[PDB]
Design a protein around this nucleic acid. Sequence first.
RNA 1: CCGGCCGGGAACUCAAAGGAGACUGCCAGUGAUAAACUGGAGGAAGGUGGGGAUGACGUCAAGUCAUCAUGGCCCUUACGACCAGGGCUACACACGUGCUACAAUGGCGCAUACAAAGAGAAGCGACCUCGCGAGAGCAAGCGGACCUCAUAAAGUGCGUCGUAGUCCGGAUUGGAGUCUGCAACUCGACUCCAUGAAGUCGGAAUCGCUAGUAAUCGUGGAUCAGAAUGCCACGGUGAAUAC
Lengths: 127, 114, 100, 80, 151, 98
Amino acid sequence: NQYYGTGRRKSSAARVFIKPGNGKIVINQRSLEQYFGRETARMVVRQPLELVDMVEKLDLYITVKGGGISGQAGAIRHGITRALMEYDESLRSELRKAGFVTRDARQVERKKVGLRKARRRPQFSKR
Amino acid sequence: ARIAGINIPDHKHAVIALTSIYGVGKTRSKAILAAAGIAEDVKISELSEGQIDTLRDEVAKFVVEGDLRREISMSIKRLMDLGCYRGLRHRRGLPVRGQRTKTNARTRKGPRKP
Amino acid sequence: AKQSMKAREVKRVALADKYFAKRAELKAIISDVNASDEDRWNAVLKLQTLPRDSSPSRQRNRCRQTGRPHGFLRKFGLSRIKVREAAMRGEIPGLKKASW
Amino acid sequence: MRSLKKGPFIDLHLLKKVEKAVESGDKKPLRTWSRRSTIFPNMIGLTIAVHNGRQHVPVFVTDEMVGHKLGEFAPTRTYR
Amino acid sequence: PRRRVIGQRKILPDPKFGSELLAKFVNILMVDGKKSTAESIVYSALETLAQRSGKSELEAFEVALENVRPTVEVKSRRVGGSTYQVPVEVRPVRRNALAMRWIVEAARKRGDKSMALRLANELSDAAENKGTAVKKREDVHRMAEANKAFA
Amino acid sequence: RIRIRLKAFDHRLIDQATAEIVETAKRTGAQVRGPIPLPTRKERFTVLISPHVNKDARDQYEIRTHLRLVDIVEPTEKTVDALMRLDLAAGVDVQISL
RNA sequence: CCGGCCGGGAACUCAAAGGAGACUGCCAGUGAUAAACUGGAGGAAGGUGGGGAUGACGUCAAGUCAUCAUGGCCCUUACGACCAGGGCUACACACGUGCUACAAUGGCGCAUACAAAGAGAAGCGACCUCGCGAGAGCAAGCGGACCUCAUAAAGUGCGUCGUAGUCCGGAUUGGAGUCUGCAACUCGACUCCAUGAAGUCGGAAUCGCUAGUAAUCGUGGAUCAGAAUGCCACGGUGAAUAC
Ligand SMILES: [Mg+2]
Ligand SMILES: [Mg+2]
Ligand SMILES: [Mg+2]
Ligand SMILES: [Mg+2]
Ligand SMILES: [Mg+2]
Ligand SMILES: [Mg+2]
Ligand SMILES: [Mg+2]
Ligand SMILES: [Mg+2]
């Protein structure tokens, strides 16, 4: 019935269900336009779909938890590509050719003792 | 227009035009306008004399420019001639709230002089 | 650390559980909106008659093995140096070196 | 005692000492080591002596000095 | 560096035009790492650039850039009691990302009201071959001829 | 109807106690929910390394507190009698709420 | 009563136990046919994938006799011990590490999305009422994936301020207060009203940073009755450049 993908970009884990039909996307019981608002957050969701040009073919039910704006928006882009990974099989090579499949494991690193912020040392004056 | 001491600034919002009165800041200026029935967005220039007339008497409920400076100078004089601690700090021109004078307190002491 | 100072801490402990576990009404019970006559003024006056040793205000909370006033740790009860001397040897259970 | 809910403060030893003085009025200066106590209007006209750390200096009471704590009128550290 | 040669990162295109060249422009203009207001200025000045003069919005950008790209720049090497600035040709990849830095910096000194108005005014000036960005480009070009005896 | 939550400073030791408790529950015959791992608590400390200055050099420690829960549901009269002092492990907290 | 709210399900995010994975493993080329190097496929990850812990023989007779122990030397009706007050916070000046700004990619007002980590028993303290506010009163819940701290902020939408020492800046000062605490003057934090200083991008010189980095925005904890712009830790947005 349904097909699934997770997405886990930068401490925000999503979950996407892809339904054949028309083109409508509901995320966390809200519409796509009103949840994000940022033009770099409602196209990055769309980027996997426009590349395969299905866009108007799939009905999406989405719940996203944790993270921020671009973290969640990036996470969805991961899950959608993973959702598309399931119910079609010959599409992997093209989808991977534009990213969307690499998890992009870049997290915030430690503060570190002796360092002021995370890599910045305090000002060093010799005398 | 013309309030207790003087109200020079036209072309400014009324809520922020009365702030030029020595004793009216922002929370009181907001209060006085509401008490007199005048909104905040309305400019002082647009105000017909049927409004500023009530403004020249509303400020009489708060001590203002005409007397506020006399009281503060009297307030400081009482401590200065008393001989108490805060009088001594005023006498020498040093901080009176008990803070650092070892390095800071340029505002109270004055410009950096060797 | 200067055994004189160590004896102060237990003298102030002894007078801390002796009074301010029972003679707390004056500073807690008779402080609020109630009969506003001199009985409250008696409570304020009578609280000073007790010795200077109050419960929180005069406890330095020093280490248990050396009596070091500074660097205390409330959880282990030792200073910041005895914790590493009651060490990674294994005296403290489940306390290993952290790396995250 | 730094709140109206608690009430103005004076030490018990000072409070009983001043009560005896007013019973006989002005007398020899009162020597006291208390500096944390407010000034009550019952000791106007006395010349109590506070201890700044090395010596007892006599502070003359006046109606104006009725809300300030006793130590205010004894400079504890000298300078020039 | 000195040991490891390395390539460059991948830039996501802008959400309104899909051009990477303007995707870097919102990056250069951005301060404190807030692309939200950084992109808000860029399109605002890009829109009023199209209506004022020229056609399109992604085309009036490329015409302007042609008048601020430096062909040759001077690099200084230390020899003796002084230094000689020896000219050297600039590779195209540096050339684009250098002109944009000149445009933004010159458009932060404008006397206009908001950055939206300043950026569009300077961009229109570039296409008309005037302004303070093209002022720098000519100077970098002029210095090359002065020190072309040291080439 | 009775919850047994187990706390310990090492996972291998806490598994020794939770393994017998289901076995005892299996010995009661049936109806065990199965141990569930609750989130772990980790306290991190940072003490200075020297008796003196060089504040910039420190040591960071951490104590973990592993968690388990078995959630016994059917209280047989022989379940209560047999579930006292049969942990066969030292240094493991036990807490039973009715 | 569209509140996971209720039966209910073990799929999904997640929790925590155990495994699989990455090894120049495979292909082409260069290489003294070798070590290895440059690329290609697959892969979530590609050449020690990112970070941490880990610091050889020794140097500075570097620091600590004030964490502690100890060789000597010394006071031992004292250089030991107890107590009240004061000082460690003093100020013609100089240096170091930081916070706040000097504004329009901002100030203020209204409305509204999205976190992670962490703490709690003479402790964290909902709810409701009161107070312009710090906060006060009664006062549930929780030694805790449930109860509290705890409304995250930068952002987004709307409105105004039009380049002024300004609706920027918040020091200083007068008055009025709240909470700990025997006790707030010396010398606490915080709140209300008024005042509004220097500051309009900083001389010589000099510091940090190569990617979730710098920059920028907020939350937590240790110490702690009260008292950090410091210290330690977490996440959100997120660069430029390496010839
Ligand atoms: Mg950060
Ligand atoms: Mg204390
Ligand atoms: Mg916890
Ligand atoms: Mg190693
Ligand atoms: Mg003493
Ligand atoms: Mg000091
Ligand atoms: Mg000036
Ligand atoms: Mg505290």
